[model samples]
Target: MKTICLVGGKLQGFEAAYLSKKAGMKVVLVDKNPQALIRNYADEFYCFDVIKEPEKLLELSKRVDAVLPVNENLACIEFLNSIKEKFSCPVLFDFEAYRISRDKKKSKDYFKSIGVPTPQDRPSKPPYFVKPPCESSSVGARIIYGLEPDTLVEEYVEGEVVSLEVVGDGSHFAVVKETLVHIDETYDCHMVTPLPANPLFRQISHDLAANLPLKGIMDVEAIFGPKGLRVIEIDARFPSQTPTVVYYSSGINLIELLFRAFTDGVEEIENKYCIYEHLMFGENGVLIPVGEQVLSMGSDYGKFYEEPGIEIFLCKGEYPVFTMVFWGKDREETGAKRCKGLSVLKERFGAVL
Candidate 1:
């Protein structure tokens, strides 16, 4: 069987595993975190620091068809850069794009050059955000009202956070998912409402992809506020969240596409629509399947569930049970069923919606 040497098992682990299952490829996942949720999803799991085990990766590189990192670790990236051309098989990564995305100034500057709108950096008053040049999920980003009033202000942006997934093969690209990332406490997202197709916006993303020299997965995150949309940061690696719902609701597997890019050739994608009410179950969330999902555990129900829709989505745990989809033909029916489903979940497992 063809083996994919995949690194960092978070949401990327799930994406890789799901695609491998469908494409008939073996996933050899590597992560330092022993309790990483992705380990459970991989065909073979390695609980080792990829950078430290240099020989291990070298050996794996010899055997596997491709080397791809789902989580962007500096060491792993450096290692891949060193040995990518040496392999006869394709090593799916874009170091040049990584160079630009790694710095906030470079990314925002690129956005400006490409004619993509971005959030305003200047503010009238003290209330503004202080953000690091490059970090994932607001790691060093915070709001400061009056602390640095005298001598402050650098590159900062504020808006409704949403992430868009795109695939490129050096010359061409396609926008697969435009997720309305909804969050509460952390920069983590549990609920995503896929946006309707906008020709203008989609065109801009395609142009942005054309401007870059990267292949495989790219995340285009932006802030949507009163001033329309402003491109925030671009990540040239597999993103952690939002892939499960995209596949379940649309049946487009990004991981599979990446695999095909090397083996066969990437397929052309068009803008499609999704009408399912897919959500994630956080702490104390439950799943009680009341519809046809329980009877027939097919594609419509849930892929990762033992009881499909009837099974409890989540227990008290650090991670969440995902893609608790409420399928229907129209928005009205979907709305009613989602309400009933949430109520049922609350009653059964005492979960917070």
Candidate 2:
């Protein structure tokens, strides 16, 4: 069995660890936090700062078959890249692509250079979406009637938010199934569900993989609005929830795909449908929509209301933040399963759904 080392045990770490287990690989996850939630999902856990204590990783590098960085820490990534060649096995990352993708301005510039459809920079409108250029996720992002001092502002595309993942080798790439993103009040994604594949999304993915010459996963997120799909942002790493959704819905294990694509090549996976959501269970059967960060605080996973096709991850607290997921052959089927699961929660667990 192949052994893999995962650096940084946050959201992505949890995703990588879960997928690695599903792929039947031995997981050795490292995180600076001793209580990192991902430790629960890993086979072995180590509390070592990748940047502060490089010697430990350097020594462990000889044992693992590969290293996959799971956090968004730039310093850790750069440090890993600095000593990448010293490692005995391959480090599955495209630092060049990641560096470019992390910077929104640079990414937009590259998109323009490669002729991919992205949102207009200064559109003639009042309601504009503003976000820091160098930040990831929804950090420092907001909607303003005007603009910002040092942020990228664009006309808020009012449509269904969608995302697709593209995994590539040095020469070949494959587009995974699409996922529809549902956001919370803070613009943080609260839920994700599978959607049918779109040719335009595939074209965009191919364009990015070919142009960036990607060697890892690149997630392209956009809004399918009145003006068509306008690209928003990209993350060149293993993302958190969508991979799980894709795994249950499409039977594609992205973590497994990464190792396989770099070695034996890739294969097509049949698509289904699934729903994944983050929520907070409150007193007297109150449930509130929460962000992934809230859900990541969970220390363990367990069955949800003893319901089939439903799993929960949670921290032990009076008000528990958790995630719920279910899957089936189609959207309607998945929806029915989710409804049944919720009904079980209401009846058996006394949840006021």
Candidate 3:
């Protein structure tokens, strides 16, 4: 099996490890945190800062079939990019594309230039969505009633929020699938429900990837409002939650596809449905919908109330957190499994939900 070296073992690292294993690839994880949960999934684990001990990664990369950076740390990304070509295997990251996508302003400008529909820079009304241009996910993100500086402000859109992953092989770009994003009251994504790919969404994914000439994977997030789909942002990095859901839903492994995009080529879906959600149990109660960041703390695979196929990774503590993956041949079946999983928490842990 091809050995893939995954740098950084937080949320994204765990994702790479899980998907790589599922894809029948050997995983070698590198992270500064010895407690990073990916160690549980990797075939090999090394705890060190590649930024400081660059030579260690370089030497280790000589034996791996590919190097996939799963972290968003700028210095590490830059360091990897600097020496990526020197490694024996290909590094599946496009720093140039990432640079543009990392900044909300630059990416928004890129969308306008490419004629991609996106939210307006100047919203005519209040209750705006303000986001720090440099941050990812819900970090530094808030709903504001007034204008804010040093932030990207757009009209708060109420609609079915959706996301899709696009994989590009320099010339060939493949739009994998679309997923429904379910967020908590704080605007944090707490769940993801896989949806079949439609032409419009596919076209949009194609447009974004082809234009960027992206050589790796990038995530497109949009809001399907009255005006139709208005892309909010794009991130040219390995995403965490959606891939697992997409995999269980369609039997497509994005990390594997990314590897193929670089080495051989790139290329699923049944009408099967997968629901990925986060849960937190604390003194307050069992919060059914928790942010994905909860997984960043560290986790371990756990049994899901004797459910044969359900998958869960739990972080135990005073306030325990866990992420669950449930799927079935269709939507109703999937929903039923999710409800049963909830009962596992309800009956076993005395969780309210």
The clash count of every prediction, one per candidate, is 0, 0, 0
* Residues 1-353 of candidate 2: C-alpha lDDT, one tens digit per residue: 98999997878887888788888899998889887866767788889898898888877888998889988888888988899888877788999999999999999998899888888887787788888988765877788773357689888888888989988887788888899999877788889988887998878877888788888888989889898988888889999889989899889889988887767766533667789987677777677888775666566543344355666665444467667788877778878888887776677557766
| Residue ranges of candidate 1 with Cα displaced over 4 Å | 22-24, 146-160, 185-187, 267-353
Give residue 50's error in model 1 in angstroms.
2.5
Clashing pairs in 3: none
Which tens-of-lDDT digit does each residue in 222-280 have in candidate 1? Answer: 77766677777788877654664466556677777776655666655523323232344
Q: TM-score of model 2 relative to the true fold?
A: 0.93
lDDT per residue as tens, model 3, 288-336: 5688665565455333344755777776644778788888888888788
| Worst lDDT 10-window in candidate 2 | 299-308
- In candidate 1, how many Å is residue 83 off? 2.0
RMSD of 1: 6.6
